[PDB]
């Protein structure tokens with residue numbers, strides 16, 4: 001509960017408060033592209049974000065979260081491996097102190113500079129709190145970031161970060177369109193897993209896009225100016241807020257594409 005990403009409270013320590021950390025379907029994992037099985041029965045993903053209603057952006061001490069109004073079916077994910085309708089509740093990123101690390105999932109052991117998680121919950125469970133207690137409660141759409149050209153749809157996020165530098169700060173963040181964070185292709189890998197921070201609950205259908213988005217060095221540098229700490233405290237830069245790959249155990253990663 002004082003968990004974090006430091007030497008003394010980072011991922012190797014989490015199991016002491018959250019024993020599920022050593023569970024059978026933990027995330028992230030390495031995606032071995034040459035052992036993932038193409039599944040021609042997997043449907044295309046349906047990302048319906050046209051009516052998304054963003055509300056606020058919050059530094060929670062672990063990442064920054066863009067929150068959405070999820071009291072109606074406004075922005076939803078369907079199709080792919082999913083049965084039913086999953087409502088977008090928030091997105092956040094994980095990133096590194098250096099461009100060669102920061103992603104949680106890896107691809108043939110390659111780490112990307114960051115990873116975007118769009119978090120959705122299965123509406124058949126009524127609310128998010130109930131959903132997280134179900135093995136099929138959440139669908140997280142994971143998108144890799146590499147450093148290159150700027151991502152124009154990211155800039156509105158980058159520019160508000162100065163206003164939420166420290167833990168517990170929030171800012172109004174309305175009318176943000178998450179479609180601007182998607183790559184061209186929706187080809188994906190999918191497997192059953194978990195939340196990647198405590199409480200580490202095993203309630204996630206992971207959908208990880210094959211195609212990374214590119215962001216500029218200036219954009220990711222701005223992520224790295226955030227703070228894990230609260231206002232006025234000694235500065236601890238919010239960097240390397242990622243959990244490393246966990247054992248795949250008895251799971252197969254499926255690919256939507258050959």
Ligand SMILES: C[C@H](CCC(=O)O)[C@H]1CC[C@H]2[C@@H]3[C@H](O)C[C@@H]4C[C@H](O)CC[C@]4(C)[C@H]3C[C@H](O)[C@]12C
Nearest residue numbers: 060063065089090117119128195196197198199
């Ligand atoms: C811990 C997990 C993020 C794991 C990850 O880094 O991918 C996140 C994703 C969605 C989060 C939840 C949702 O955003 C809704 C709630 C937001 C509140 O600010 C905290 C509780 C709240 C219930 C969150 C708890 C926790 O931070 C959740 C469950």
Ligand SMILES: [Zn+2]
Nearest residue numbers: 092094117196
């Ligand atoms: Zn995450």
